[PDB]
RNA sequence: ACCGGCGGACGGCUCAGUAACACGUCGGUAACCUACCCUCGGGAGGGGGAUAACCCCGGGAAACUGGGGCUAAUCCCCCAUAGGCCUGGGGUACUGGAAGGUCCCCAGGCCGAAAGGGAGCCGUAAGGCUCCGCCCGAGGAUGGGCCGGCGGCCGAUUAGGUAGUUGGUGGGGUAACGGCCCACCAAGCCGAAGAUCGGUACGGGCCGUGAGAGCGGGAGCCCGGAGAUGGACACUGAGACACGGGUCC
């Protein structure tokens, strides 16, 4: 599976996007939301991405993503499947009206090949 | 779900065909079967006109009053009997008029826990 | 005691909370007079009143009857066949909205 | 432009359903709710928090929608005090035809406010002086909910109908009374003065016609009811189960 990674450096406010595929991306398949993974193990020229000296053995944790059809991932739904449920707030819905609820199509927590975008942040 | 509007029967026995939908201001809610427990638990309901009701779902203490006008806050052991329903006593359901046993004697409940949120009882002799 | 009708109360007392003479029930509205025609249910009687209706096209009258269910307190305890006085109150059951407040002439 | 406040429940449209407390009229609520408005009596003390807008990177054919950075309020949350509600014991100040009401004193509990904020002058500054505002209590007003007596269609080639059905006792639930709904105890309730069932129909103020008595109609204007492709069901709010808001078949 081919993954488009969005890496955010929380201490600076700047993000970078790269594309990763192959055995590197095949490592990531199976991780939930809120779990860390070292960047060196995955393999990324991190000091060249941002042009800054970075601490050793620094790791990253997955924050979210969007599937290939445009639906996002919702942290509170277990499994990798795609569902269609009624929402009142939170990721995957922007209300615009008081007390409004709407039925939206969303994903789960676990990563799968159907995913295209992966949002992660750097964790020192 | 729970509609308290009107009966669909005439006093002569004939049937009535409903002539409109159910209005929102005619609905009721699930009964709270107040049980005896180790710790008390209550919730708040927003009601017509934007008012509030305190609903007691689990009771552990009670207020007991003697004929002299003094009161004590003691804890509840069990429900001896409840004339409202045949099987309330076994399940330990408290309603107004039930007989409860405490550490200072038997008492008869005088308040409505589902509408007030407290259990008040008068001491029996 | 007086409850606003200016008539004599019943002789003995009772324990019914729905008795206007001895309980918490309040009366307000119409006051009618009639004859008991049924007393089978507990604490309930049926009272009949008769009146005339004018038929304008035929310039003659016809007789009609009105039947009302009333609550019967134990202190009064009316029977079939006597004249009673009834007063309007809040709803008490599906079909009961009046209460007997005096027996004027025992059967 | 965005956050925040108020409004979008009125106004407009149509007459399918409905023979019913739907409508007309006289009464009742001592059995009930009410944002905006009016009068009088009081209060505004101490802390905390995020986030849109904006910056970086985006995903999807579109409808829509993700992560990270930073920020404010008349935005949100705590603590206190005022205040509210329930039950038991006393007292007799109020209104009324009549107190399960209001008022005072003890006692056991539960819930639980607020924005001194904004604008303008005198202010050297100190601080006033108006203007618009925030919270609680008592009453009114406005808009409604609920209940009763009486009044107005056709059919017997439809004669018996009803079994939560009619009433009682004990509860639940509701803004509120009530078989409105439960548990138990009885056998009631309606009917040839037409019950039950079938037909047709939104009701009235009014309109057409006739010497009058009558006979026929009820689209257009006003007052009430109901509906938003058919059938069910919820969120927010003072008020909706909402025509230009949501969910299922
Ligand atoms: Mg029609
Ligand atoms: Mg508080
Ligand atoms: Mg007609
Ligand atoms: Zn009596």
Swiss-Prot record, chain A:
Q: Which residues form a coiled coil?
A: none
Q: Which UniProt keywords apply?
A: Ribonucleoprotein, Ribosomal protein
| GO annotation, biological process | translation
Q: Name one Pfam family in it.
A: Ribosomal_S6e
What is any one of the record's Gene Ontology cellular component terms?
ribonucleoprotein complex
Fetch the InterPro entries from UniProt: Ribosomal_eS6, Ribosomal_eS6_arc, Ribosomal_eS6_CS
Q: Does the entry feature the keyword Ribonucleoprotein, yes or no?
A: yes
PROSITE patterns reported in the protein's UniProt record = RIBOSOMAL_S6E (PS00578)
Q: Which GO terms fall under molecular function for this chain's record?
A: structural constituent of ribosome
Would I find Signal among this entry's keywords?
no
Stated family: Belongs to the eukaryotic ribosomal protein eS6 family.
Which HAMAP family does the UniProt entry name for this protein?
Ribosomal_eS6 (MF_00512)
Return the protein name. Answer: Small ribosomal subunit protein eS6
Q: Which organism is it from?
A: Pyrococcus abyssi (strain GE5 / Orsay)
From Swiss-Prot, chain B:
| One Pfam family linked to the record | Ribosomal_S8e
User: What keywords tag this UniProt record?
Assistant: Ribonucleoprotein, Ribosomal protein
Q: Name the Gene3D superfamilies on file.
A: 2.40.10.310
Presence of the UniProt keyword Ribosomal protein in the record: yes
Any single GO CC term annotated in Swiss-Prot or TrEMBL for this entry = ribonucleoprotein complex
Q: Which InterPro entries match?
A: Ribosomal_eS8, Ribosomal_eS8_CS, Ribosomal_protein_eS8_arc, Ribosomal_Se8/biogenesis_NSA2
Entry's Gene Ontology BP terms: translation
Q: Name one GO molecular function term.
A: structural constituent of ribosome
Q: Whom does it interact with, and what assembly results?
A: Part of the 30S ribosomal subunit.
Family annotation (NCBIfam families) = eS8
Family of this protein: Belongs to the eukaryotic ribosomal protein eS8 family.
Query: What is this protein identified as?
Result: Small ribosomal subunit protein eS8
Species, as recorded: Pyrococcus abyssi (strain GE5 / Orsay)
Curated annotation (Swiss-Prot), chain C:
Q: What does this protein do?
A: One of the primary rRNA binding proteins, it binds specifically to the 5'-end of 16S ribosomal RNA.
PANTHER family referenced in this protein's UniProt entry, alphabetically: 40S RIBOSOMAL PROTEIN S11 FAMILY MEMBER, 40S RIBOSOMAL PROTEIN S11-RELATED
Instruction: Quote the InterPro entries the UniProt record gives.
Output: NA-bd_OB-fold, Ribosomal_uS17, Ribosomal_uS17_arc/euk, Ribosomal_uS17_archaeal, Ribosomal_uS17_CS
NCBIfam families for this protein: PRK08572.1 (NF006345), uS17_arch (TIGR03630)
Q: HAMAP family in the record, alphabetically?
A: Ribosomal_uS17_A
Q: Where is the signal peptide?
A: none
The subunit field of the Swiss-Prot or TrEMBL record says:
Part of the 30S ribosomal subunit.
Name the UniProt key words of this record, in alphabetical order: Ribonucleoprotein, Ribosomal protein, RNA-binding, rRNA-binding
Please list the GO terms describing molecular function. rRNA binding; structural constituent of ribosome
Q: What GO cellular component entries does it have?
A: cytosolic small ribosomal subunit
Instruction: Name the gene for this chain.
Output: rps17
> Would you tell me the protein name for this molecule?
Small ribosomal subunit protein uS17
Q: What organism is recorded for this protein?
A: Pyrococcus abyssi (strain GE5 / Orsay)
Q: Which family does it belong to?
A: Belongs to the universal ribosomal protein uS17 family.
**Keyword RNA-binding included in the entry's annotation:** yes
């Amino acid at each position: 599976a081919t993954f488009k990674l969005v890496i955010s450096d929380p201490k600076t406010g700047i993000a970078k996007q790269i594309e990763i595929t192959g055995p590197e991306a095949e490592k990531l398949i199976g991780k939930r939301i809120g779990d860390q993974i070292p960047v060196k193990e995955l393999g990324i020229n991190l000091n060249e991405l941002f042009g800054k000296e970075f601490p050793e053995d620094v790791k990253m944790e997955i924050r979210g993503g969007t599937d290939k059809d445009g639906f996002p991932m919702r942290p509170d739904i277990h499994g990798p499947r795609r569902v269609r449920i009624l929402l009142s707030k939170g990721p995957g819905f922007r209300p615009k009206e008081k007390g409004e609820r709407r039925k939206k199509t969303v994903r789960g927590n676990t990563i799968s090949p159907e995913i295209v975008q992966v949002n992660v942040k750097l964790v020192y | 779900a729970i509609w308290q509007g009107r009966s669909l029967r005439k006093p002569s026995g004939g049937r009535i065909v409903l002539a409109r939908k159910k209005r929102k201001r005619e609905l009721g809610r699930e009964p709270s079967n107040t049980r005896v427990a180790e710790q008390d638990k209550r919730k708040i309901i927003r009601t017509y006109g934007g008012n509030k009701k305190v609903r007691l779902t689990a009771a552990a203490y009670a207020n007991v009053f003697d004929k002299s006008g003094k009161g004590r806050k003691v804890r509840i052991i069990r429900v001896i009997e409840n004339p409202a329903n045949r099987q309330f006593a076994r399940r330990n359901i408290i309603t107004k008029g039930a007989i409860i046993e405490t550490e200072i004697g038997k008492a008869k409940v005088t308040s409505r826990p589902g509408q007030d949120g407290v259990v008040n009882a008068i001491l029996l002799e | 005691r007086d409850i606003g009708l200016r008539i004599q109360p019943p002789a003995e007392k009772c324990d019914d909370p729905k008795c206007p003479w001895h309980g918490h029930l309040k009366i307000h509205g119409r006051v009618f007079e009639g004859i008991v025609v049924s007393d089978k249910p507990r604490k309930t009687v049926t009272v009949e009143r008769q009146y005339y209706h004018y038929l304008k096209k035929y310039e003659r009258y016809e007789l009609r009857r009105s039947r009302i269910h009333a609550h019967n307190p134990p202190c009064i305890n009316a029977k079939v066949g006597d004249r009673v006085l009834i007063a309007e109150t809040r709803p008490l059951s599906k079909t009961k909205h009046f209460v007997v407040v005096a027996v004027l002439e025992r059967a």
